[PDB]
Design a protein around this ligand. Structure first.
Ligand SMILES: N[C@@H](Cc1c[nH]c[nH+]1)C(=O)O
Ligand SMILES: N[C@@H](Cc1c[nH]c[nH+]1)C(=O)O
Lengths: 256, 256
């Protein structure tokens, strides 16, 4: 079948990380939306005006609200994109055929929304040259971050070409995990997020979402389907684009 | 020699069009700055807050102001980047070793600053699906534009890969030529802009800055050096990146 894929970037990135996968999926006949989330890509807001991961997810929620009754999309999220998928499926589970997690966080319904992110910080505590700043929004002090260039080169874009890495240096923006607000956020629901089909895609070559973390997530909340891509690095949509397009063709053929 | 290249994008683009050339130049030992100009790339201003091509050029002027007495840069501009180079050389001709024009407008000192742009609109009057809007800034009605996707595919990125074209679709922003303000702008000076060494790089395969226009510019204001790259398309820094790096190595070796 042909599906409508909505591609969701991770924090500090934008729709541009999908510039290689999007043409491929369309060449297979699929419709692809690649959103900039708030204060990401060429979205005009700055991160200081955003007070939560729910506020951050506004372009996706507004997108899902705009879809006509009866059509469904496959949400594909990378790295912190998994949290935007949990927020959107709690409000629009009827519009979601399946969610694909691509080297992504996999929140559950049993522990606070920050749980998987707290576990990532234990497995991965050294963020090299990443800088931090704080700002206040709606009386909350938030810790923002700007990804360091050596962390981008070594851990996220390990095996990507120097020109792909260049785009990351040029285009990554200040973001936030909003970790302290995620903690106090109500849990993802069983009937919303819990009911979505979840396909987990990952590589053991990922240098930040290390195998210990990723296999830990698989055991904590079993995905409906798990696919392990051999080789690649953290940005599989850049180092293993064809393989991810094949996996996504197979997800379209199975879920609607 | 090694030089400091400052790479200047055209309107509606950002530093990201240089993501392929910048690694190459650095791999040859050069320093490279690739600026976002105002309301371009991931610069936070919107085009409605910009009232002229001089306001637009602010990141470049502030950059040139920050350089310590005695160091010099080679300015490399693409397409409307030629006008940012004329504005900057009228204020900082002492900081400029040479300016490279890359499929670029080549303003002169004899006619109003809009002259070459008025001649482009005569040679190239059909801008396909490009949209326009007007806004008012400092009592002037400006015509802004947003490049159409079929114009980007066919005329600007003709021969670029689908993934490079994808980045153009995802990242191009609303811009303005500020043509009516350019007309009333004082002429570029002979002692500033007129005294800069100008190297003109172009391809006859360019589908918007057609050979008639480009050869016309060469005859109107003779460049110090002219290089014609065989093949390629309008975005030579994407289709002929190595050839442009070689030409820029040779410009560094000759000018300082
Ligand atoms: N840039 C990060 C996004 C992230 C930072 N920290 C946690 N997640 C990535 O691609 O993985
Ligand atoms: N995007 C155009 C910039 C421009 C539009 N019109 C004139 N110049 C280019 O790359 O040529």
């Amino acid at each position: 079948a042909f599906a409508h894929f909505v591609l969701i970037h991770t924090i500090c990135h934008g729709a541009w990380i999908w510039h290689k996968l999007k043409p491929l999926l369309e060449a297979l006949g699929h419709k692809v939306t690649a959103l900039d989330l708030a204060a990401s890509g060429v979205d005009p807001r700055q991160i200081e005006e955003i007070g939560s991961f729910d506020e951050y997810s506004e372009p996706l929620l507004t997108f899902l609200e705009a879809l006509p009754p009866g059509e469904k999309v496959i949400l594909v999220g990378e790295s912190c994109g998994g949290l935007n998928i949990a927020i959107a499926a709690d409000k629009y589970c009827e519009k979601i055929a399946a969610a694909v997690f691509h080297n992504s966080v996999l929140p559950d319904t049993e522990h606070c929304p920050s749980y998987v992110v707290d576990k990532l910080m234990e497995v991965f505590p050294d963020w090299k040259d990443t800088t931090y700043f704080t700002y206040t929004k709606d009386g909350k002090e938030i810790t923002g971050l700007k990804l360091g260039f050596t962390l981008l080169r070594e851990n996220l874009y390990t095996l990507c070409g120097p020109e792909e890495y260049e785009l990351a240096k040029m285009l990554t923006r200040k973001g936030s995990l909003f970790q302290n607000i995620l903690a106090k956020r109500p849990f993802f629901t069983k009937e919303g997020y819990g009911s979505i089909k979840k396909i987990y895609v990952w590589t053991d070559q990922d240098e930040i979402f290390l195998p210990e973390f990723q296999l830990w997530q698989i055991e904590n909340y079993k995905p409906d389907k798990v696919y392990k891509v051999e080789g690649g690095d953290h940005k599989l949509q850049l180092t293993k684009t064809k393989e991810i397009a094949e996996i996504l063709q197979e997800v379209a053929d199975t879920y609607n």
